[PDB]
Amino acid sequence: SGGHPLEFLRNQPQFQQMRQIIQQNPSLLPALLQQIGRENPQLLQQISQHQEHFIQMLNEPVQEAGGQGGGG
Numbered sequence: 045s046g047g048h049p050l051e052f053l054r055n056q057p058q059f060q061q062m063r064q065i066i067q068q069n070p071s072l073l074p075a076l077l078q079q080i081g082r083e084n085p086q087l088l089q090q091i092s093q094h095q096e097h098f099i100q101m102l103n104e105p106v107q108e109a110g111g112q113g114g115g116g
């Protein structure tokens with residue numbers, strides 16, 4: 045529920061999904077956003093306001109690489 049503090053969203057598995065794939069596919073930013081908007085149209089609109097923070101933290105290295113991979 046942290047609108048400006050994206051770091052609180054970062055800890056959500058839904059965001060982990062985006063972060064892991066971003067590290068392999070940064071061009072998938074507008075694509076992953078659609079996955080957010082699908083389940084969370086409200087959260088999406090808030091992310092649209094705070095995209096800068098979103099993309100920056102999406103790009104940082106994450107612990108869980110992701111079992112589904114995403115990249116390739």
Ligand SMILES: [Ag+]
Pocket residue numbers: 048097
């Ligand atoms: Ag800020």
